[model samples]
Target: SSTMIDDEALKEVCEKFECSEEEVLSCLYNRNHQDPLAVAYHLIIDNRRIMNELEHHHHHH
Candidate 1:
């Protein structure tokens, strides 16, 4: 079981959401305290959803 997430890796993902490292870490910590797997899962799903929305709205141009 991993107890710690690499800060650099987290910051990379945060960049996609236009969030600061602090906001990302805070959200991650909040979730990791309950379930680490859920935090990771939601992050991936969130990014995928964002991409899908972007494509849906902008791809027709």
Candidate 2:
């Protein structure tokens, strides 16, 4: 079982998301799942969802 992710791969994905390596890795670890790419994809979705929600809230306010 692997406990650590590849920092090089993580950096590549994180670059696209504007999130820190710690932030992405935290999500990956917290979820207790493997597959760095999968974790990265979910992080992107989550980030976009949050951004959309905030934008919606601001527009409404």
Enumerate residue pairs that collide in model 2.
Answer: none
- Candidate 2 on 18-61: residue-level lDDT in tens? 77777767767678556565566566667868999999999997
Clashes of each: 0, 0
Query: lDDT tens string, model 1, 1-61?
Result: 6677665457555666666666667766676545444365466767778989999889786
Q: Pick the candidate with the highest TM-score.
A: 2
Off by over 4 Å in 1: 1-3, 32-61
User: Model-by-model lDDT, in order?
Assistant: 0.64, 0.70
Best model number under lDDT: 2
Deviation from truth (RMSD, Å), model 2? 9.4
